[PDB]
Design a protein around this ligand. Structure first.
Ligand SMILES: Cc1cc2nc3c(=O)[nH]c(=O)nc-3n(C[C@H](O)[C@@H](O)[C@H](O)COP(=O)(O)OP(=O)(O)OC[C@H]3O[C@@H](n4cnc5c(N)ncnc54)[C@H](O)[C@@H]3O)c2cc1C
Ligand SMILES: Cc1cc2nc3c(=O)[nH]c(=O)nc-3n(C[C@H](O)[C@@H](O)[C@H](O)COP(=O)(O)OP(=O)(O)OC[C@H]3O[C@@H](n4cnc5c(N)ncnc54)[C@H](O)[C@@H]3O)c2cc1C
Ligand SMILES: Cc1cc2nc3c(=O)[nH]c(=O)nc-3n(C[C@H](O)[C@@H](O)[C@H](O)COP(=O)(O)OP(=O)(O)OC[C@H]3O[C@@H](n4cnc5c(N)ncnc54)[C@H](O)[C@@H]3O)c2cc1C
Lengths: 566, 563, 566
């Protein structure tokens, strides 16, 4: 064989890497040990960043067609059982109108719900169509790096044959027990994630629309706490509880109990179990090897950051491998992938873990031990309807405990969006880091300073709304300015012809192709009309100039050469 | 010939009074000079207060049918012509996502567009169906007050007969030239406007969906004439601040910018406003409301809305006094509570006008261009120069500032603050508005404020705090630890002969603080209570269920009723 | 390697075969020469039979999510150009209310529009998930049959390796130049399909919603006639015209002309060409080899019968291979696949061709030659607005010509649905063949006589509508009767235990699981309440008894043994 990039793993990080590279005309071979895309729904939250990526490569409309929408997700119920009495609800996934506004303001895209079961084949099939080579039932074994590329060994689970593939780079997208990460010798940290613990799932099928229609939610959590998650509303489900476990048809009895009733016909599907050693890689890159996805960040599902961060890892790297492979960028461009993605890997493992500690106080508020007998809980239900002042303090205590769980259920908007990149890939503009005015995990803060994601606002094109994001992306640098910065067009042209690099310039303003109709661009840009922002193929601002002066203009070339390592 | 209340006027203010009175079992006679309801679309913005009133009387679901919802109203375009180039847009009627959150947090109800052409008949039929006698083609001529009621003289425009009506009260809802306001001798304070001039409106049909559907707005202003939607997107009205031929379709063709679409000119009418508010709305047995007491500009569309709210304030009061449950002094809070609103909404409506000249100044246009000055300005606006960018920034600033009259005045719409004998103070100081009080609603539970909206649940279904309340009766809201309120309410209800529904909100209860938003908005302890008037306003707040706290309910209610 | 069934080809016939077999627990290996599912939209009509199959294996809801619906398809415009003047319209795809009723009455499912581009990966991904082995970049070469199975040779386009796979059967789903059909020596007929002719496609992207919104159609045909087909409304398209052809950016000029205007921005995508030798196989089976799809019927797109007939070939065979592979059926069960599917192969090639002849009379009515100059056509437009009686006869002539094209554009409901099976697989009940009361190509006729598809009507289950079809299918024979035929339950039980075969019985009636609420079952069944219908895994009736008499009961066993070849 022979390819430019061997992509080991076909899950979200791998499927997305192959699609982006193929879109960029890079030859890739993605492999996967198993028969299919993944049997389980697993990962189901899709945050705005991953829906932006889908938008940029034209797959958002598909994603949206197969995905429950945000209006079905909001009602997070805490209760005894599905048919029993609620303790309370919380506005999950930004359903609170203030949350929703903060959400809608931050991006053109929105939260949906799309199980991995569906997400994966949609991306794998697209990578193949875009020209990536894809090959399942192929079980990576190892590799040997030399100065000019790599030579890993493959075991073919159909033929029984074994073979070699010569590449230039290897992406290790191979999941939570990355053999690619072991062989590249990646150091891992923060392993003290509370005694290694798993969870046990249990798919089933029942029409509980009579218990869900009037209160539409992504999830329904019973107090040992067990979650009822909607695969498809409202006939498909899955029960979770915190735990190699075995269960029979006796799981049907657990479900009925969870439903609080035994009179909807149930149909028990597959039963899996999950385990996690919570860790992150301190570095994600070794020589020609680059790991991503679960391969470098392993954690709890709290916040559903994994799949989303996994795809964003792929979006960071792809255009960089493509530029280097084409000789338009030095290989040192590739150093920033660790510089930018590794701090995201630690932050999300740490955040996902920290959310687990928001749940014991729910039990403490009701004066219930870690594990409560049925008489114990039934008594806590009684204490809670007590007409005394102590019953008040108690109802207030539970409300406060419940509210605090939201950080893990749609409240971490800051965590999802607040990426801040420091690297060679990002040319600093001399301004100091401004801060987050509000808590940076809870609330997103838009920034146009180099290192931040391009902020969303609406422009219009033909009197139709277009996002600032839809101007950019597509495996090509974009320069945004206004009428008074007309010189940018020429400066960009010189820089692009000389550096052999595509750089689209958009002069936003009246009578232009794109118009700052609502004035929201002037508002969000942080700089004069004549200033420019340079936006990387991955939506991040890498260069910012305040005006169109000669010294501002002269600096574009220095920044692009610097970004490219030339 | 004999009724308890004679309502003069069948516009929004009159029809609403009749409907509420009738709903309350009070005999009324509502009259109207003309043949029909108003044939003009006129006022169309329905704010949340009016939609709340509609919901309370079960008419919310109806209006909404015949309503254009908020999603169609947002895109306010400023342009040269409809098919020409936009200068820019502003997010009108709370369409900016932050405005929208503030809007939706403030109420169960939402902005809609429902022309008065449709609103009126919807309410006049309900007034008639609910028990009210209604009788158009009948002109109020004058009346004479005496000690026991009033005698009007009516002029039947079908018979030529003239007769008398005896009534215990008279509502003057007879519009911008109230004769009822003149004869009652109500004082008016000016004095805004130079001098007292009107506008011209032009109805017309035309299929304009191809210029409106990708940019859904309530309104499209051209540089100043407004092109306002009646029905999306085929029915219309062209306004601008006489005599006009039917062949003024020209002016329309040019305002919409093309002439390729068939246009069918309907009626052409003129509106003249003399900006004034009554200092007092009440004289003896005469109570004025609507345009009769506040005459003003359409900036902000506060006028139909504040006109209905006048009716919602007065009705349950007339009914309680007519029933003898309440003393006649209870009526005194009508002027104390509604007159300050009447001066506030004229002044506000007028002040918005002055946000428009700065648009022309940004354009460096003369107050009124001529010809190629309006073409030249556009060129300056596209100027690559640094002064051109100052011009664009200046144009943007001027535009943004017009929002105060186009959905921005949420505070104005909602921040009612009543001080009177019908509001029983709880001893706390007036909290301030943390933010600007014209732009931003501030929720309050302090007596004199409207009951705050938040969502509880009933049968795991969302219900608003507002739905528990009103319905022509006083409501007391408390929590589980406030169990005693309900005995106390029962004792107060028998001793005074007045309905007081008590709702104990909590787990296991009929209504549940499912999201905990009530504990959060309440402001008091779970065992505190809030008393809400039939008109959704809080008149008594207790901080807990202590014996001192319990004891005060009966003093408050007696005090609210004048007894 | 080693599998029970080697499936050569991964298009609709192959992807559907692998999904059904995997659903039935049969080990399959499906291969495909190329990188991906097919780049082109191609096949886009989905008729009711293929939407029934999708329903039965639980993929209809997916199919429906990614598919334009019938309400967008109806307006078939004939015109000069898209922005020019229409000649007239016809109610395509059963949009006429009478057509629509006949349509809705015939099935629980409906016409949609779903390009192959999307349909294929949705089925391939499902086959893999259901446990079929799938392997692209694998290029069948040949095989050698012996008495116990087959041994074909494979060429691996990733490794360069070659290898053998031992199977029991081979399905030849390998398209219009079936190497599997050549090697099995299948005779082909009806090749005189008018001098071999092709067509030339031309994908593009433009927002012509302003010309389409008000008249929603699947297609817009210009008069050389060139068709504007909607890939996605209304931004995606493709231009066709009847023709190895080459075109440049000069195709953009053809498009603009077809649009009649050059002011919507266009974006020219890929340009392919199609060619067809119209033929059908006289037999589809040779020893252990079974061909299906284009492999046995090659034809024009008129009526869009290919993809739909292709999938139905797979649905006929799968459950038969599974029963034989499990030893519950003799191998002679497999003889009926040719007996039932081959007459469908000839009928559809012949029908698809015959539709082409409905188009010249449109040109003849307007007195235009085969190929008309621009002055010629412009003159025909003039003649057509002539205020004379000869202008009348002429407008009437064109209306009649246009109406007659509908047989190829949604009018052939009889062709789509009127399958009549005669074979060992179908146990005859002694009644004569009743006939079609109306034209059997135009109008569907429901039949419960053995050999016909189970008729659709609505029952209810929990007061919810359920189709008679939803009772049946699932790789298991089903027996439908009513309360007075209670004996069927026991007779079925004896027959099933002794024959080692699953046979679900449904006793439809009041107070039962399924209820003849509307009485439409009594109406459609053609037999007493106590009669039974036996329905094959593929929805076809194989046995019909008129009542529950002892002789009726005694015959079930004879029929099932006979169907199974035992
Ligand atoms: C059982 C389970 C349940 C989960 N539930 C949730 C949940 O409820 N919520 C949530 O937020 N997250 C959940 N997750 C986490 C989740 O599925 C992801 O984080 C995501 O799938 C990981 O992305 P990758 O693309 O980074 O991982 P992967 O999807 O695991 O991709 C790894 C790929 O590499 C392949 N591979 C591995 N080794 C080799 C090899 N040696 N050679 C060739 N191929 C190889 C694998 O087969 C696979 O194709 C769950 C994970 C699992 C396993
Ligand atoms: C032509 C016109 C256009 C308008 N356009 C707008 C607009 O675009 N936007 C906006 O916000 N507001 C607009 N308004 C303001 C508006 O219609 C209201 O503020 C509202 O109608 C006033 O309510 P009332 O119910 O208070 O007034 P009215 O609707 O005028 O009700 C008065 C009633 O009393 C009756 N009446 C009067 N005299 C007698 C009598 N002597 N005897 C018996 N009955 C009598 C009248 O016939 C009428 O039925 C417009 C008003 C007019 C006249
Ligand atoms: C370019 C084109 C345009 C078309 N347009 C239309 C249209 O507009 N309307 C319409 O109704 N129909 C159209 N069709 C017809 C259509 O696409 C089908 O009838 C259908 O795809 C055929 O089903 P199969 O599943 O029977 O065929 P195929 O989709 O062709 O499946 C054949 C499969 O076998 C593979 N294969 C072939 N040989 C080998 C081998 N030696 N080894 C391994 N694998 C092999 C192929 O790669 C492919 O995966 C078009 C066809 C083509 C080719």
């Amino acid at each position: 064989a022979e390819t430019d990039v061997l992509i080991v793993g076909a899950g979200p990080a791998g499927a997305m890497s192959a699609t982006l590279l193929a879109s960029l005309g890079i030859r890739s071979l993605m492999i996967n040990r198993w028969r299919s895309t993944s049997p389980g729904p697993r990962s189901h939250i899709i945050n705005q960043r991953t829906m932006e990526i889908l938008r940029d490569i034209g797959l958002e409309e598909s994603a949206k067609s197969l995905a429950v929408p945000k209006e079905y997700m909001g009602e997070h119920v805490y209760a005894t059982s599905l048919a029993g009495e609620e303790f309370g609800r919380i506005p999950a996934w930004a359903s609170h109108p203030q949350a929703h506004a903060e959400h809608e303001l931050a991006s053109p895209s929105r939260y949906c719900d799309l199980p991995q079961l569906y997400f994966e084949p949609m991306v794998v099939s697209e990578a193949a169509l875009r020209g990536a080579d894809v090959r399942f039932l192929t079980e990576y074994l190892g590799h040997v790096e030399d100065q000019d590329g790599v030579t890993a060994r493959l075991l073919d689970h159909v033929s029984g044959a074994e073979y070699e593939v010569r590449a230039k780079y290897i992406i290790g997208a191979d999941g939570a027990h990355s053999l690619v990460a072991q062989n590249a010798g990646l150091p891992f940290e923060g392993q003290m994630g509370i005694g290694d613990s798993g969870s046990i799932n249990i798919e089933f099928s029942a029409d509980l629309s009579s218990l869900c229609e009037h209160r539409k939610g992504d999830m329904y959590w019973m107090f040992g706490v067990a979650a009822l998650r909607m695969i498809r509303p409202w006939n498909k489900w899955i029960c979770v509880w915190g735990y190699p476990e075995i269960t029979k048809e006796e799981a049907k009895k657990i479900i009925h109990e969870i439903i609080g009733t035994d009179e909807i016909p149930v149909e028990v599907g597959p039963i899996s179990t999950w385990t996690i050693n919570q860790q992150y890689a301190v570095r994600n890159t070794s020589g020609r090897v680059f790991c991503m996805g679960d391969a470098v960040h392993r954690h709890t599902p709290m916040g559903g950051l994994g799949l989303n961060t996994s795809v964003q890892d792929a979006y960071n790297l792809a255009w960089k491998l493509a530029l280097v492979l084409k000789g338009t960028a030095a290989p040192t461009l590739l150093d920033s992938y660790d510089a930018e993605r590794s701090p995201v890997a630690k932050q999300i493992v740490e955040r996902a873990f920290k959310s687990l500690s928001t749940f014991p106080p729910v039990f403490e508020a009701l004066s219930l031990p870690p594990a409560p007998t049925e008489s114990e809980m039934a008594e806590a239900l009684v204490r809670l309807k007590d007409a005394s002042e102590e019953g008040a303090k108690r109802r207030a205590a539970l409300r406060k405990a419940m509210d605090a769980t939201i950080i893990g259920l749609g409240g971490g908007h800051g965590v999802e969006l607040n990426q801040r990149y420091v690297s060679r890939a990002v040319f600093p503009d001399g301004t100091p880091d401004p801060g987050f005015v509000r808590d940076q995990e809870f609330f997103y803060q838009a920034s146009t300073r180099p290192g931040a994601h391009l902020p969303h606002v609406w422009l219009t094109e033909n009197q139709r709304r277009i996002s600032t994001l839809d101007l950019c992306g597509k495996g090509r640098f974009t320069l945004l300015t206004g009428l008074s910065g007309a010189a940018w067009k020429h400066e960009a042209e010189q820089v692009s012809q000389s550096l052999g690099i595509e750089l689209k310039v958009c002069v936003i303003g009246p009578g232009q192709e794109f118009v700052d109709t609502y004035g929201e661009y002037a508002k969000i840009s942080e700089i004069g009309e004549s200033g420019a922002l340079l936006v990387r193929p991955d939506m991040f601002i890498a260069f910012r100039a305040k005006d169109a002066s000669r010294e501002g203009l002269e600096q574009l070339n220095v920044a692009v050469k610097s970004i490219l390592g030339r």
